[PDB]
C-alpha cells in the first residue's frame, strides 16, 4: 500500500479515478498523441486522517517553465487576494521591517499589494514563466520549490519571515514535512504560518471530485490539519471558511502555544466530528455519489447529442482533464472549450484532447448548451456571458448535482 506522508500511517483507498494525464499539459493539435499518465485514486491515513491522493506526481512535470496557470485571469480572486494583503499589511506586518513569504506566488495576485505597500517580501515561485510575470510587477521571486533547504537559504540572507504564506499551493505537496521543516526554519518565533485550499468538508457535500487531479494531493479538513501541525511543532489557531475554488479553509499556524486557538478551531473541529466527515463510511459515500454524477453526466450529454443540441465546455480549469477523463468526455460530445487563458488557446485539453478556443469565441451564434468547467467561477464568468443565456443558451453544471439553468 501507500505510507501516508505526513506521519507515516496506513494509507486506505476510497476512490479511484483511474489513469489520468497531467492536468495543465495542453498539447497543439499537431503534437504526437503520447502523454504521462499516472493513477489518480484517493485514500485516507489510519492514523492522522489526512485524505491524500496514493501515487505522486514529480514535481518538475507539473511546475516548470511553461505551467500555464495564470491566478490573475479572475477578478474575485484579484480583489480577494487584495484583502487578504491588506488585513496582513494591517495585523501581523505592522512592525519595524516586517518580511512576507510566499510559497507559490504565480503571477503576483498577492504580493502585488504587498509590493505597493513597501513591505519586504519574496515570493516562490518554481514555474518560471509566471514568476517572470510577478516580477514585471516589481514584486521579488525567487523561482524555486520552497522546502526545508531554500527556507534556510532564505533565513540565513533575510532573517525570519512575520508571515508565510500559501494559497491554493500547500495541498499540491506531498513533501510537506520539508515544507513545514522550512517554516520552522524561517517563521518569526511570534509568526503565522497561513494557507488556504480547497475544504474536505466541500468537496464532500458538494461531490466536487474534480477537485482532485494530479496537483492537489492532500484535501485538507481542520482535523487533519491539527494533526500535521502538532506532529511538526505547531499549533492549529485559527480556521476561515471561504467560498473561493469551490468552498475553502484557511488554516493559521503558530508555534505551539504561542497563541491561544480562537473559538473557530474548536467548533469546526466539532463539527467534522459531529458529521463524520473524515470516516471511511463517509468518504466511501463520497465515492459513490462520484460514479453517480459521472453516469448522469454522460447520459445527459449522450442524449444532448441524439437530440441534435449542440454543447460546449467553458473554463479549460485543471479540474476538467479530471472530469473528462473518468467520464470519457471528448469532443464528440464537447466540441471546444473556451477559455481566457492565452497559453491554453489553439491546443487541446489533456486526455480527451478537446479543442480550446479564446473565450472571445464564444458569441453569436451561441451552442445551445456550455457545460460548466469553470463551476468555482460561475458567477463571474456568467456576468460576462449574459447575451448567452439571453438568447436561450443554457448552463449544464455537474457540481453539487447534474442540473441545467
Ligand atoms: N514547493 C513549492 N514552492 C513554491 N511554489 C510552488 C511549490 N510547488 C508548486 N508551486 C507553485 O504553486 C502554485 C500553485 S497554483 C496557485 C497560485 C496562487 N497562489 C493562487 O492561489 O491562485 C503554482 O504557481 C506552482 O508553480
Ligand atoms: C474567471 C474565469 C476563468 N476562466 C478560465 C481561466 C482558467 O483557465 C479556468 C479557471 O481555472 P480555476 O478554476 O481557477 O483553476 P483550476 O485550473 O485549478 O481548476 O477558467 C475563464 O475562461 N473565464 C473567466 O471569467
Ligand atoms: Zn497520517
Known amino acids: 500500500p501507500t505510507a501516508c506522508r505526513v506521519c507515516g500511517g496506513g494509507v486506505q483507498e476510497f476512490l479511484d479515478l483511474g489513469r489520468q494525464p497531467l ?33 505522486e506526481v514529480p514535481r518538475d512535470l507539473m511546475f516548470h517553465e511553461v505551467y500555464p496557470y495564470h491566478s490573475s485571469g479572475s477578478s474575485v480572486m484579484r480583489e480577494h487576494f487584495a484583502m487578504l494583503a491588506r488585513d496582513f499589511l494591517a ?8 518580511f512576507i513569504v510566499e ?30 510575470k510577478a ?8 523561482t524555486d520549490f520552497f522546502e526545508k533547504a531554500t527556507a534556510d537559504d532564505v533565513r540565513r540572507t533575510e532573517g525570519p519571515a512575520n508571515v508565510i504564506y500559501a494559497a491554493n499551493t500547500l495541498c499540491n505537496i506531498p513533501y510537506v514535512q ?49 494533526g500535521m501541525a502538532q506532529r ?34 474548536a467548533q469546526l473541529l466539532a463539527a467534522e466530528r459531529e458529521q463524520e466527515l473524515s470516516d471511511m463510511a463517509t468518504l466511501r459515500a463520497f465515492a459513490g455519489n462520484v460514479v453517480k454524477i459521472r453516469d448522469e453526466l454522460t447520459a445527459l450529454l449522450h442524449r444532448l447529442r441524439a437530440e441534435g443540441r449542440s454543447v460546449v465546455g467553458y473554463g479549460a480549469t485543471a479540474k476538467s482533464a479530471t472530469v473528462t477523463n473518468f467520464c470519457g468526455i471528448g469532443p464528440d ?26 473565450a472571445s469565441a464564444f458569441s453569436d451564434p451561441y451552442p445551445d448548451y456550455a457545460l460548466l468547467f469553470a463551476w468555482n467561477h460561475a458567477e463571474e464568468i456568467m456576468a460576462k456571458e449574459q447575451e448567452f443565456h439571453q438568447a436561450g443558451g443554457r448552463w449544464i453544471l455537474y457540481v453539487p448535482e447534474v442540473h441545467i439553468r
Open 23 to 55: 492536468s495543465d499539459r495542453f498539447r497543439k493539435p499537431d503534437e504526437l498523441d503520447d502523454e504521462f499518465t499516472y493513477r489518480l485514486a484517493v485514500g485516507r491515513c489510519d492514523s492522522c486522517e489526512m485524505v491524500q491522493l496514493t501515487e
Open 91 to 98: 495585523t501581523e506586518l505592522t512592525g519595524p521591517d516586517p
Open 103 to 132: 510559497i507559490g506566488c504565480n503571477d503576483g495576485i498577492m504580493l502585488r499589494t504587498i509590493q505597493e505597500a513597501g513591505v519586504r517580501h519574496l515570493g516562490f515561485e518554481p514555474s518560471s514563466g509566471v514568476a517572470a
Open 135 to 142: 516580477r514585471e510587477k516589481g514584486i521579488r521571486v525567487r
Open 178 to 226: 520539508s515544507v513545514l521543516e522550512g517554516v520552522d526554519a524561517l517563521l518569526a518565533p511570534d509568526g503565522v504560518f497561513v494557507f488556504e485550499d480547497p475544504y474536505l468538508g466541500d468537496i464532500v457535500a458538494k461531490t466536487s471530485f474534480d477537485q482532485i487531479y494530479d496537483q492537489h494531493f492532500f484535501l485538507f479538513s481542520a482535523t487533519s490539519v491539527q
Open 232 to 265: 511538526c511543532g505547531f499549533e492549529l489557531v485559527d480556521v476561515q471558511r471561504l467560498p473561493v475554488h469551490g468552498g475553502e479553509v484557511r488554516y493559521t499556524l503558530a508555534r505551539q502555544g504561542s497563541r491561544t486557538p480562537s473559538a473557530a478551531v
Open 333 to 358: 460530445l464537447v466540441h471546444s472549450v473556451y477559455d481566457t487563458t492565452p497559453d491554453k488557446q489553439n491546443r487541446l485539453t489533456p486526455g480527451a484532447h478537446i479543442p480550446v478556443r479564446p
